[PDB]
Amino acid sequence: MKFTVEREHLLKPLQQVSGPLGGRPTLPILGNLLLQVADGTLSLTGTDLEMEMVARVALVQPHEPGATTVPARKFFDICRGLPEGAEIAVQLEGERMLVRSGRSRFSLSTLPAADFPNLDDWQSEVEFTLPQATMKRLIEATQFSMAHQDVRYYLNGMLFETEGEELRTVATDGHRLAVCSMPIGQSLPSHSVIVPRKGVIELMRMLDGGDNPLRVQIGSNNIRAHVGDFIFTSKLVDGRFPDYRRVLPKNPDKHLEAGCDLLKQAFARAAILSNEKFRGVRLYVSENQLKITANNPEQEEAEEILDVTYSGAEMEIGFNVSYVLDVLNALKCENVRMMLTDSVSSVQIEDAASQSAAYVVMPMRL
């Protein structure tokens, strides 16, 4: 195997395929990238057994077919450490892969290309295309609400649901939920799959082409995304993902609307004197007025008063301020709307000027 490619054509591919690598896995081969040269193309693959990232790099300079695997981090660092415009020649020599650029020479230890773990073959059942910006919005709007290491595995990811001409994402950790729906102009069959948490992040990270098209293929147990010259594939998470419609407040009798920035900064300051681990803050709503209070074990207190548009009975309701701030930070808008019922029930929050995304946060008993 042999090839010579410009540094600038190898940097992004190497960075992207190294994505699924933990950087310190308990398996040497998983710390390597599979390099394959065939028919004028250099293919680079990185994997963590659950998902894989493949990059294809056209080879315009002479090359020879073959394959091997080399340490991902070292190879990337070497390529990025070379000068701008550098030509990188690579030549496989058994248990070592040589790299040369100018008078910079390197020898990396290899592992058989046959030893590289590849996901099993599968069949696509549904596929659609959309702007990378759209997929990116869908993920960024809800990813922060995914669970991390919940025993309820299906929560450690994001639901991707197609319905009508819309693609929707839902994420929740049992305490809060985020849902976003966007139309894509293609009649789609009703379907839903759960993408693993790590897979969601890797997908979000490969989106940078703005209006450049993204191709999605969903199988019974896998999802695949074609982004330019990158192909991301991940296994799916089994389980029944909850129905967001069931947590949305019913017949909200209390409604609040206020500037997003002022609301966010008030919660931010109040948070300073909230319990460091429980982060509880109290909200008191009355005619056109919101009062936010916080106190910690040292008996310190914070109080913020804001002019707001509020209709409904006066009420006190508690919240984990971090959950509230997460929502306000995810909303990049002028005004926010909140719909409530009672002190221990769901509260829905959204951009007062858009219904494309909605957030539900469960209060705390304070």
């Binding site: 305490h175 705390m364 008993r365």
Partner: peptide
């Protein structure tokens, strides 16, 4: 519980 859990019914 101090933090109320979402009720998916």
């Amino acid at each position: 519980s101090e933090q109320v859990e979402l009720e998916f019914d």
